[PDB]
Amino acid sequence: EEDPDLKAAIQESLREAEEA
Ligand SMILES: [Zn+2]
Ligand SMILES: [Zn+2]
Ligand SMILES: [Zn+2]
């Protein structure tokens, strides 16, 4: 069982890193 909130938080982290 994967956790959609974990994945969503990491995906958000990736988008955020791409802003730099
Ligand atoms: Zn699983
Ligand atoms: Zn949660
Ligand atoms: Zn949640």
Side-chain angles (χ1 to χ4, degrees):
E1 190 78 4
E2 298 165 25
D3 185 326
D5 279 356
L6 176 58
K7 294 190 287 183
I10 296 164
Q11 282 156 20
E12 186 59 28
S13 298
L14 193 68
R15 279 193 279 282
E16 286 290 327
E18 266 291 325
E19 287 167 20

